[PDB]
Design a protein around this ligand. Sequence first.
Ligand SMILES: CNC(=O)CO[C@H]1CO[C@@H]2OC[C@H](OC(=O)N[C@@H](Cc3ccccc3)[C@H](O)CN(CC(C)C)S(=O)(=O)c3ccc(OC)cc3)[C@@H]21
Ligand SMILES: [Cl-]
Ligand SMILES: [Cl-]
Ligand SMILES: [Cl-]
Lengths: 99, 99
Amino acid sequence: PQITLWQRPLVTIKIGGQLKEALLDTGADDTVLEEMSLPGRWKPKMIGGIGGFIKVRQYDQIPIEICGHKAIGTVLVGPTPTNVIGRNLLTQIGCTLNF
Amino acid sequence: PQITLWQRPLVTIKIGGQLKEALLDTGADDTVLEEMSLPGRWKPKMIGGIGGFIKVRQYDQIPIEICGHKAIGTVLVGPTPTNVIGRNLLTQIGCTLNF
Ligand SMILES: CNC(=O)CO[C@H]1CO[C@@H]2OC[C@H](OC(=O)N[C@@H](Cc3ccccc3)[C@H](O)CN(CC(C)C)S(=O)(=O)c3ccc(OC)cc3)[C@@H]21
Ligand SMILES: [Cl-]
Ligand SMILES: [Cl-]
Ligand SMILES: [Cl-]
């Protein structure tokens, strides 16, 4: 698809059996989701943006589907104000900026 | 250009005659730069990110070049961790997401 930026670039993702809305976010290194359960190991991490840091749980090798596109990668879970899809998953679906 | 997302999408911008580095950020509604001087009057704005809110100064109708592409619009100045070019200016330079 070609996604305009007149509005926030929101998409539906499938993750851990759940459907969720998330923002396609080229300014995020990592994918960060609001509190949810995921299977497997995790380790604590601090991630920072505007306004400072939050503590998250880092899960590796999580399957996700974005716009019909399957990918696997690291998902950070914690008290983000909104779900963002970061570059670590945008690359996998072949997402580019164009102008 | 077509910019992939394996690395941060950092580009050179020009504002007030000076070059800076900034992140092309589809997850940002607005453009927020690190402390700097701009002309005219400013208005207050609170913007929120991952770690909470910050107060910024809002300057309107500012000329800014982004990867050589000319824009004129609203620039927020405050204690952001990194310069970010948000959708307000990404739309001016004709940027889309594509996959
Ligand atoms: C300190 N941390 C660092 O150095 C790097 O660590 C960062 C980078 O990668 C990592 O992944 C998750 C996090 O990334 C971000 O948070 N990304 C930020 C941009 C940004 C990039 C680097 C640092 C700080 C912010 C978003 O892409 C934009 N907005 C955040 C929203 C999408 C959560 S915004 O910035 O809050 C904002 C809100 C309103 C506005 O107008 C209204 C305009 C902007 C970590
Ligand atoms: Cl990853
Ligand atoms: Cl590629
Ligand atoms: Cl603007």
